[PDB]
Amino acid sequence: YFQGHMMIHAPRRWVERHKQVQVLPQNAVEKLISMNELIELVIECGLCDKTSIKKMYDKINTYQFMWCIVDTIPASQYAEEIFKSSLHFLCALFLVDDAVESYSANEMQDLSRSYDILEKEVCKTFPNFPSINEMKESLMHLRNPFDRSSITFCMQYVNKITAILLEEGNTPHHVVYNLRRRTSNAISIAFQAVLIKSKCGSITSHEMLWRRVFDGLVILFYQFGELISGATETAQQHITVVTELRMLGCLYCIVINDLYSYQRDKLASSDNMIKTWLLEKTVSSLSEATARCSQILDAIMKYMYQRVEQCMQSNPGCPQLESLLETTIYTTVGWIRSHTTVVPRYSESQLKVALVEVEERELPKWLAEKDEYGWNVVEKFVETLNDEKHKGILDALQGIADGRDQLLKTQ
C-alpha cells in the first residue's frame, strides 16, 4: 500500500493474455467495425443520428473495449457477424443508459411493460421474427419514441444472434432457444432493476450487492465470448457455475465502476456503495474505501480461481469447458484493463492501479491468504445468489424460465 493504493491481484497466466495485441488486418477490422451498418441501423430505428453514434464510438472506444471483452478471434463469417452485432449493441446500449438514468417511475414502468409484452409476443413466432418496422407496430401506442426505438434495438439484437446461430448447423436448436430467452430475460431484468430504483428501501450492504450486480447488463457482455467462440452448447450443458462466475464478474465490474465514478465531477447519485459505506461505516473516505474494494476484488479473483479449478477437476476430459472457463476469466480480468486505459476515465486523480501478478510459487500462499472482509462479502453474495427465494432470478438468467424480479427486492 502506497499513494497508488488501488493494489489488486490476479494470476500471471490470467493477465499475460491482456498484454496481447489484436493480430488482425484492416480488411477484418472494418468487417467487424461496420460503421455504415451501424449508421443505417440507428437511423432505421428511431434511436439517434450519425453524430450521436460517432460521439459514443469516440467516447467508449468500443472496438478495444470489445477486445477486453472477447478473447477469441472470429474463425468464420458467422463469428464476424456476431462480433459486429455485439459491438453495435454495446455502443448503443450505453447511449440508452445515458438517457434512462433520469427516467420517472411511470416512464420506466411503461418501458419495461412494453419489453415484457413484446418478448412474449415474439417468443411464439420462433424461429421466425418480425423486422424492425414490423416490430414498431406493437409499440406505436407509446408516447415517447425513444422507448420504442430502444425496445426495437434490444429485441433486434436478441433476434439477430438467434438468426445467426440458426443459419448455421453448429449449435443445436433447443439450446439456441434457451440462449435467446436468457438474453431477453437479462434485458428485462435490467429494466426491472432500474424501475426498482424508484424506491430507496424499506439499505443493507448485501441487498446493495444484489442490486448493483443487476444494474449494468454485464452478463450480455460475457455472452460475447461464448458466442464468438462457438461454445453455446457447452455453456448450456453447464449453465450453473458459468452463471455464478459471470455474476462474480459482474460484481467485480460494478465494484470498479462505483470506485471510478465516485471520483468524478458528476454526482454518483444511485446506490453507489462507497456512498453507503461513508454514510455510516468508513473513517477516512478514499483510503479505506479503496482497501475495502481491493479486498472484495481479490476475494472475487480467488473464489473464481478455486471454483474453476474445481469444476475442471470434477468434470475431466472436457476441453471445450476449459476454454469457456478461461474465456470467462479473461473477460472478468479485462475490466481492470478497460477502466485503466480504454474508457474515457483518464482522470489520474482517480486511483492509479497497481496490478500485481501472482506467480505459481505464490499461488498456494495467495489462495490461503484469505483472511479479509471481502471473503465474507463474496461468501454471503454467493449464498444470496443460491438462495431459494432467488431461484426464479437464477432460472431467468439461465435459459430456462420467465423473467420476474420485482417480487424479491421490493416485495
Numbering used by the authors: -5 to 196, 198 to 406
Question: How do the authors describe this structure?
Answer:
To address these issues, we conducted genome mining of terpene synthases from the sea whip coral Paramuricea clavata, resulting in the discovery of a biflorane synthase PcTS1. To fill the research gaps of the mechanism and structure in marine biflorane biosynthesis, we performed genome mining and biochemical characterization of sea whip coral–derived TSs, leading to the discovery of one biflorane TS, PcTS1, using GGPP as the substrate. Isotopic labeling studies, together with calculations, elucidate a cascade of 1,10-cyclization, 1,3-hydride shift, 1,6-cyclization, 1,2-hydride shift, 2,6-cyclization, cyclopropane ring opening, and deprotonation by the generated pyrophosphate, forming the biflorane scaffold. Our work demonstrated the mechanism of marine biflorane formation, elucidated the second crystal structure of a coral terpene synthase, and realized the terpene skeleton expansion.
Followed by several failure crystallization efforts with full-length PcTS1, we expressed and purified a truncated form of PcTS1, PcTS1ΔN1–5, which lacks the first five N-terminal amino acids with catalytic activity unaffected. However, it distinguishes itself with the absence of one helix (K), the elongation of two helices (H and M), and the presence of an additional helix (O) because of an insertion. Notably, PcTS1 shares a remarkable structural resemblance with microbial TS-like proteins, in concert with the similarities observed in ErTC-2 (15). PcTS1 exhibits an overall structure that closely aligns with the tFold-generated model of PcTS1, with a root-mean-square deviation of 0.94 Å for the Cα atoms. However, the tFold-based model of PcTS1 features two additional helices (K and P) and helix M in the apo form of PcTS1 is split into two helices (M and M1), underscoring the significance of protein crystal structure analysis for achieving more precise outcomes. Notably, R212, D215, and S270 were identified as critical for activity.
